[PDB]
C-alpha cells in the first residue's frame, strides 16, 4: 500500500535559536536565561552549554545549501529576542534584525518558505532580573519585540508561531526548575502559564491591528493520554492528566476557558487566584491554525499515591520499544490525538511544528550514519499522519524535528534528533540516511509503507 | 499459459575474449596474466590452456553466420587489452584494433547489435610486473585503453560494460589465488577491489567527457543469499555474505558507499582502509543500467567455526537438482534477486549480462546433443525473468552464457555452458538443441510458461 | 505531381581547369601548386596526376558538341592563372588568353551561356615560392590577372565567380596539408582565409571600377550542420561547426564581419589576428548573388574531448545511404540550407555552382552506364531545390557537378561525379544515363519526382 499526501501539503524541518545558533555574546546579543542557566554547574549534562552549538549564526549559507539539497518546502526556525532587544525593551540592535532579515531573504531566494517562532525559550536575562514571565510587564515587552519583527518580516513570512511549548517552560522552568530559569514554586508556575498565553493573545491582537498578510498560531507540547484500563477511575485519571498537561493550553486558546477538572485539583491543594475574564477573551482570539509537537504517548492509571491522584503505568509502558530519550514508540498515538484535536475544538486547521526521534547515532567505517531506527520511527508515525488526513483531518503541514543535531537543553548534546549529523568539535555536517529518505519522501510526496 | 516478453526486449548471447579467441601470441598481442597462469602446472584442470580455445580469432565469420542462423539480436563479447596495448600503455597495436573494428562492423552489417566488455580478466602481464591492479597507476592505464576503444567504435556500439565480475577477480585471483594472477593475500584482495571500481568510475567519467551516444554499465557477479532458518543469527549471516560478495560492488557504484556490516567484519580481523572520499563520488558516477551474471542461489547459516562468521547450509542444498558445477538449480532465486535490485538502488534499468548452465553434453548416434536439462534449466529461469517484468521490474536485456563451448578458467574445457557445441580437437560447431530452442524463443519472443 | 522550375531558370553543368584540361606544360603554361603537389609520392591516390586528365585543352570541340547534345543553357568552367601568367605576374602568355577567348566564343556561338571561375585552386607555383596566399602581395597579382580576363572576356560572359571553395584551400591545403600546396600550420591557414576573401573583394572592386555589364559572385563550400539532439550543448556545438566552416566566409562577404563564436574558439588556443578594419569593408563589397557547392550534410554532437568542442555524430550518420565518397545522402538538407541563406543574409539571389554525386560506374555489356543511383540522388535533391523556390527562395541557377568524369584531387580518378563517362586511357566520352535524364529535365524544365 503506497501513501500519497495532499498535493498542497507542505513538508518542513524545524530548529530553535539557542539550540543551533551559538554566538552567545556576539554582535550585541544580550544574555538569555539559557546562557545564564547553562553556565552554572548541576543544570546541563556533562557541563555542556549552547555558547557554540551548531554555530548556525555563521554557517547558515552551508545549512541552507543542505536544506535545498534535501529540498524542504518550509524551514521552521526561532528568532532570538536578545539579539533584537539585548535589554528585552528599549534600544533596538539593528545587527540582530539584519541577521534574520538576511537569513529569511536567503530562504525566499532558494526554494524555501520561512516559518518563524517568536519565543523558543530565550527570554532576555534582564527581564528575568525584574521577575521574568511572573512579572506581567514581560507580556507587553513580548508584544513590542513582536511588533518590530512584523514591521520588517510581516507579510513575506507566511506561517508564524507565537510560542514553543509553554507547557514545558512553566512546568520544567518554573516548578521542577530543571530548565531555565531554574525556579521551583508551584504558584509561580501557574502565574507564568497564564502570562505566556496572555502574551500570545497580545501578539495575535497586534498581528491583526497591523493586518499582516500571513497565518499565526501557537506550537503546543501535546501527547495522547490513554487510560491504563477501560475503568471509571483510570478513564478519569487520564482526563485529569491531559487537562493538567496539554488541555491547560488548548482550552484557553480555542475555547477561552481553563479546564475545570484541573482547576478543581488546584483549590484542593489550597490555591485559586482570579484570572481576569477579559484576559481569556484576549487569549481565545481566533487563530489561523493550531500547531503542536508530538513524539510519544502517555499511559495513566489511578493512584491515591502521588499528590496529583494519578501516575504513569510503568509496565504497560515496558511493552514498547523506547527511543534514546526513554519515551515509548507508538505511532497510532498520533492518529488518535489528531482525531481528538479534530473532534474537540471544531475541525481546525492543524500543523505539526515538530515530530522526530533521538537514537544513538554513529559514523560507521563507511563514513555514513545508517539510522534505520529513526527512518523506521519516522515512516511509522507518517503512516498515521496520512491515515488521519484520509479520515477527514485538516493537517496542512509536517515539520521534522530536527534539521540539525542540536543542544537538547538539560540533556546537553548527548541526544540527537537531527537528520544531518553535526560533529560538535569540528562543526562538520553529514546528512543522515533519514535525511536522504526525507528528500525522496518530499519528492514522491509520500512512500510505500 | 504462454509468456511473451516486452516488444523492445533485446535477446542476446555472451562470450569472453580469452575463453574463445585463442591466437594467444599472434599479430603482436602481448601476454596476459591468464596466458601466464595457464602455462604453469597445477592451475588449470588437465593442464588445459586458452592458447587455441574455440579459435574465434580466425573463425569469427563462421560464428556470426551461426549467431544470425539462431538470430540473436545482441552479441556480448570482450576486447583483449593486450591486443590493443601489448605493454598495457604506450605503443598502439593497430592489428588488434582492426580485428575488433572489423568484427563489430560484420555484426552491425548482419543486423546483430554489439555489446562490448572492456575488461574480462586479461590484464596485460607487463602491468602485473609493476603490481597489476594493486598499483593504482593501472586504473589510469585502463582509462587510456578505454579512450582508444571509444574514439574508434564508440558511437556504433550501443551497450558497454566496463568490468566483468570484479568480485571474482579480487576474491579468486588475489586472495584464494586459484584464478590469475594467482596471488594469496587478503589486504591486496581489497586494495584491488577498490582499484577495479575506481577504474570503472574513470571509464564512465571519460565516456561522458567524450559524450559517446551509447549506454555504459558494469557486469557484477550476483546471487540471492537466503538464510538457512528465519532466525536472527542466520538472517544476519546471509546479509553479511551478500555484502562481502555482491553488495561490496553494488553499493559503491549505486549508493557511493561500502557496506558497513562487511567493513566491520574486516576491522574485526585488524584490517581498516581509508578509501579517499573523492574516489567514492567517482565510482558512484551515474550509469545507464546495472548488469549482473547469475546462475544459482546461496543458502547461508550462522557459523562461529568459519572465521567468516557463516558457511553454506549443505543440509538444505542437498535437496535440489545440481548442475555439472555442483551449483543448485533454483529458478525463483532469480526473481527475488531482480526484486532486490529493483527494491534497493531505486528501480534502475537492469540487464542480464550472463545466465546459463553447464551439464554433461554428448553427441549421440544421431550426431546431435539433445541437452533437455539445459533447455529445462533455461525455460525455468526465464519464466521467473518474465514474472519480474510483469511485477514491475525494468529488465531490458537477457544475454545467454555462453554462445559457444569455451575455456571455463581453472576448470579447463571440462564444463560446457555453450548452446553451440565445440570439438576442441577439430574446432567444428554443432548448434545444441538449447540453441535451436533459443532461436524459436527469440522468434516467438517467448514460449509456454 | 509533376514539378516545373521558373521559366527563366538557368540549367548548367560545371568543371574546373586542372581537373579536365591536361596539357600541364604546353603553350607556355607555368607550373601550378597542383602540378607540383601531384608529382610528389604520397599525395594523390595510386600516384595519379592531372598532367593529362580528360585532355579538354585539345578535345573541347568534342565536349561542346556533347554539352549542346544534352543542351545545357550554361557551362561553368575555370581559367588557369598559370596559362595567363606563367610567373603569376609580368609577361602575358597570349597563347593561354587565345585558348579561353576561343573556347568562350565557341560556347556563345553554340547558344550556351559561359560561367567563368577566376580561381579554382591552380595558384602559379612561382607565387608559392614568395609565400603564396600567405604573402598579401598575391591578392594584388590576383587582381592583375582578373583585370586582363575582364578587358577581354568582361561583357560577353554573364556570370563570374571570383573563387571556388576558399574554405577547402585554407583548411585542406594550408592546415591539414592533404591538398596543394601541402602546408600544415593553423595560424597560416587563417592568414590565407583572410587574404583569399581580400582578393575576392579587390576583384569585385576592380569589376565595378571597370563597369563590366555582367554579374559577379563567389562559390563557397556549404553544408547544413544539424545538432545530434535538440539540446543546448548540441545546438551550440553545430553553430560553432558551421561558423568555423562556411559562415567564416559567408559573414565577411555578406555581413562584413567574422563569426564571433568561431573567433572566440581561436583566441582560446592563443591565436588573435588584427584584420585591418578597411579590408573587411572591401571584402563586404556588394555582390549580385551568392553561389555555393553542396553534396551532403553534417550531424554534429557536443564533444569536450575534441579540442574543437564538437565531433561528428557517427551514431546518426550510420542510418543513411552513403555515396561512393562515404558522404550521407540527405536531400532535405539542401532545402534547409537554401532557407538558412535566405533568412540570415537578406533574401539574396542564390546560384548553385555545384551539386551532384559520385557512385561506382560500370560500362555494361550494352556499352552503356546505367547509374540509376546518381539519377535517384539528382532527382531527390532537385525536388528539394524546387520545394525551396515554391517556399519563396531566389534560387536562379543549378550547375551539375560534373559534366565530365575528372581528377578528384587527392582521391585521383578513383571517383566519378560526371554525367559523361571518360575512359582515362583512351579519353572516349560515353554520355551516362544521368546525362540523358538531365537532357530531358532541361527540355521538360522539370520531372514527375
Swiss-Prot record, chains A, B, C:
GO terms for molecular function: beta-glucosidase activity. PROSITE patterns: GLYCOSYL_HYDROL_F1_1, GLYCOSYL_HYDROL_F1_2. InterPro entries: Glyco_hydro_1 (IPR001360), Glyco_hydro_1_AS (IPR018120), Glyco_hydro_1_beta-glucosidase (IPR017736), Glyco_hydro_1_N_CS (IPR033132), Glycoside_hydrolase_SF (IPR017853). Pathway: Glycan metabolism; cellulose degradation. Its EC number is 3.2.1.21. GO terms for biological process: cellulose catabolic process. The active site is at 165 (proton donor), 354 (nucleophile). Signal peptide: none annotated. It catalyses: Hydrolysis of terminal, non-reducing beta-D-glucosyl residues with release of beta-D-glucose. The keyword Transcription regulation does not apply. Keywords: Carbohydrate metabolism, Cellulose degradation, Glycosidase, Hydrolase, Polysaccharide degradation. GO terms for cellular component: cytosol. Belongs to the glycosyl hydrolase 1 family. This is Beta-glucosidase A. The lineage of its organism: Bacteria, Bacillati, Bacillota, Clostridia, Eubacteriales. The gene is bglA.
